[PDB]
Design a protein around this ligand. Sequence first.
Ligand SMILES: Nc1nc2c(ncn2[C@@H]2O[C@H](COP(=O)(O)OP(=O)(O)O)[C@@H](O)[C@H]2O)c(=O)[nH]1
Ligand code: ALF
Ligand SMILES: [Cl-]
Ligand SMILES: [K+]
Ligand SMILES: [Mg+2]
Length: 250
Amino acid sequence: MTEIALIGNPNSGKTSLFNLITGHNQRVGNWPGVTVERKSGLVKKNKDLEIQDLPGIYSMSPYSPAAKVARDYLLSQRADSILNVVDATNLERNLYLTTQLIETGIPVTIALNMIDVLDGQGKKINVDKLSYHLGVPVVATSALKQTGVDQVVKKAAHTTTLAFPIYDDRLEAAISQILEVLGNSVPQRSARFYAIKLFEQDSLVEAELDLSQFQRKEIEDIIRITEEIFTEDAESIVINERYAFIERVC
Ligand SMILES: Nc1nc2c(ncn2[C@@H]2O[C@H](COP(=O)(O)OP(=O)(O)O)[C@@H](O)[C@H]2O)c(=O)[nH]1
Ligand code: ALF
Ligand SMILES: [Cl-]
Ligand SMILES: [K+]
Ligand SMILES: [Mg+2]
């Protein structure tokens, strides 16, 4: 069955969207941290789509066990579509997570939620330009006004029937080298995600993959060589490339 996962920052409106899509009445609150575990439901208008409400998350290197629930569901390879719920009033901050979601290889559809909040403040956001620069479908949504909901579910449903944010080519060289070291050690769909996290020296991914000493020695050498090329630490190279990619689109 087609699985759509609701991924987004805390308090961005994920459960609000879930309740409209499923007809459920899961807990919704005007403060972050209401949802703490996964909740499933059928799309009321297409009973062939199953959608998953998940706790808020800021980064695929999560800062909390609740957020790690959302990361673990994505990396369990059970989701066919990521419905990325983006707080339209906090575009830049939300898009940092969005870049990592795209790298997972699971097709991403953006629900630009709380668009009524932006409307009241007289602010505009060209969805077509944002979609063009991110490489994913984008739909302005409002769970309060109940606008755009059915539309974003259809496009998420159809991404399941991929262009990654391409960073500095010096970093892309290292990513390709780490990919060839990984081989089939990771699911092919999410190979780029694991390669980047390994470059970031992410502790979660390192503990999860359990690579051989032969693999780890080369990855370390790739990181060190690339760090010398950038004259910057590995973790900061990726963070700077994510934000630099965002500013070109925002
Ligand atoms: N104005 C406006 N408020 C919203 C929208 N979506 C959600 N909210 C409000 O934001 C708060 C948090 O929503 P919630 O569903 O709990 O977000 P979640 O934490 O990601 O699940 C609730 O008080 C909602 O009423 C929207 O599109 N527009
Ligand atoms: F902050 Al929440 F579900 F309560 F993402
Ligand atoms: Cl987080
Ligand atoms: K909330
Ligand atoms: Mg919630």
